[PDB]
Structures are given as structure tokens and as C-alpha cells.
């Protein structure tokens, strides 16, 4: 029952500062523009100890499966090859990505009927709000 409130299909409804976040991560112009235009559906499911997060959009379809606290190698939608660890901290899913001596954290939180995604690198944050599909 660890992630019960996150499970489901969620659709993007708002975004703030995502272009700047992507600039900080190092994403190039054309990818930023097409990725920024995406309106992803995020699909979260749990089977035993294995969590799966899919993100589907006209930009890219991604899928990760993982066990909490257990690192995995990930190819991000922007084509970074990162070492990722996802943990639950106080009811927040905390997704840390390490690559080329850099780090970024993606937090996923349930707030009211929304699923809020907060993306941080260095002092640049982006907040993206999803609603049930």
C-alpha cells in the first residue's frame, strides 16, 4: 500500500518555469521547445515492491520500473544517461538523478486532488501540476 495515493493516470494541467529548468539541466533549444510543448500523461502503477512510472506524450514515451531505495540506470526523455534513486520521504516520492558530476531532484507529491511535480537543479525550480485523467 506504499504508493496507493499516487497510482493512476494523470494529465498535465499547468507548468511554471520548465523552460528555465531545462536550460539549467543543459537541454538544447529544439528539444526544450518540443518538450516544453508536451502535455504528458503520467501513469503510475505498483506490483509488489516494483513501482512503474510511464510518461506518454507526442514528444517522447518513457517508462521506468524500480524498487524504492535501489539505484538504477535511466535514459531520460532529453537523452541524459543518469544514475537514479527513488525513495519515499515523508509521503513524497523523491527521484534523484546523477550524471557528469551534476544532480537534479524531481519530487512528486499528492496535494488535494492533484499530483504536483517539483523539478530542482541548483536554484532553478519548476512546478508542474497534474490532475486525474
Among the listed residues 10, 35, 86, 93, the single contact to ligand IQH using CB under 6 A: 35
Instruction: Indicate the residue among 7 and 77 with the shorter CB distance to ligand IQH.
Output: 77
Q: Is 128 labelled as part of a ligand binding site?
A: yes
Sheet holding 124-132, edge to edge: 61-66, 50-56, 41-47, 8-16, 124-132, 114-121, 102-111, 92-99, 81-89, 72-75
Task: Tell me the three cell numbers of residue 102.
Answer: 551534476
Q: Is 129 labelled as part of a ligand binding site?
A: yes
Matching residue, cell 494529465: 11
Residues whose CB is less than 8 angstroms from the CB of residue 89 and which lie 6 or more positions away in sequence, other chains included: none
- Does 51 interact with ligand IQH (rule: CB under 6 A)? no
Q: Minimum distance between the CB of residue 25 and ligand IQH, rounded to whole angstroms?
A: 4
Q: Is 46 labelled as part of a ligand binding site?
A: no
- What are the binding residues? 128-130
List residues near ligand IQH by CB under 6 A: 22, 25, 27, 35, 40, 42, 55, 76-78, 106, 117, 119, 128
Amino acid at each position: 500500500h506504499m504508493c496507493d495515493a499516487f497510482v493512476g493516470t494523470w494529465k498535465l494541467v499547468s507548468s511554471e518555469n520548465f523552460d528555465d529548468y531545462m536550460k539549467e539541466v543543459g537541454v538544447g533549444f529544439a528539444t526544450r521547445k518540443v518538450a516544453g510543448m508536451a502535455k504528458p500523461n503520467m501513469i503510475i502503477s505498483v506490483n509488489g515492491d516494483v513501482i512503474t512510472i510511464k510518461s506518454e506524450s507526442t514528444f517522447k514515451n518513457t517508462e521506468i520500473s524500480f524498487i524504492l531505495g535501489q539505484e538504477f540506470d535511466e535514459v531520460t526523455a532529453d537523452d541524459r544517461k543518469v544514475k537514479s534513486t527513488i525513495t519515499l520521504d515523508g509521503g513524497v516520492l523523491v527521484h534523484v538523478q546523477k550524471w557528469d558530476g551534476k544532480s537534479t531532484t524531481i519530487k512528486r507529491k499528492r496535494e488535494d486532488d492533484k499530483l504536483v511535480v517539483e523539478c530542482v537543479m541548483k536554484g532553478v525550480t519548476s512546478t508542474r501540476v497534474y490532475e486525474r485523467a
